[PDB]
Design a protein around this ligand. Structure first.
Ligand SMILES: *C(=O)/C=C/c1ccc(O)cc1
Ligand SMILES: [Cl-]
Ligand SMILES: [Cl-]
Ligand SMILES: [Cl-]
Length: 125
């Protein structure tokens, strides 16, 4: 286990240092997206929540291919506003329901430290 709490103020500094193996040690789901919504990183805890295989979703587009239920003003709309503004830090509850049992989660989206990358963090509620 890596000891990082969901919603920590400086989480993007802490995560900047982790390779894929370290990301898999987090207590919550973590997805790293580029500015277009393509998946660069996808950890084991997220795959436990959603059933997706972390190795197979890398390189897919989160909003178009993997998670169409997030293609909406309430999720994707906030993401694209943050990408265009260059800043993003929002936390909200959502239901994941595409090809899975509907699962209520808390979502935290935050701009990463490195250039054109954005984090999506996920835990059950
Ligand atoms: C809605 O379609 C959500 C799908 C989804 C959310 C999060 C994931 O990690 C994978 C699929
Ligand atoms: Cl919380
Ligand atoms: Cl980073
Ligand atoms: Cl999969």
């Amino acid at each position: 286990m890596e000891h990082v709490a969901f919603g920590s103020e400086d989480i993007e500094n802490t995560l900047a240092k982790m390779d894929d193996g370290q990301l898999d040690g987090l207590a919550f789901g973590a997805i790293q997206l580029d500015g277009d919504g393509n998946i660069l990183q996808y950890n084991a805890a997220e795959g436990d929540i959603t059933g997706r295989d972390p190795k197979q979703v890398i390189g897919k587009n989160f909003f178009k291919d993997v998670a169409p239920c997030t293609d909406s003003p309430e999720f994707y709309g906030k993401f694209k506003e943050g990408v265009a503004s260059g800043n993003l830090n929002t936390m909200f509850e959502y239901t994941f329901d595409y090809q899975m049992t509907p699962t209520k989660v808390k979502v935290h989206m935050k701009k990463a430290l490195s250039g054109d990358s954005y984090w999506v963090f996920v835990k059950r509620v």
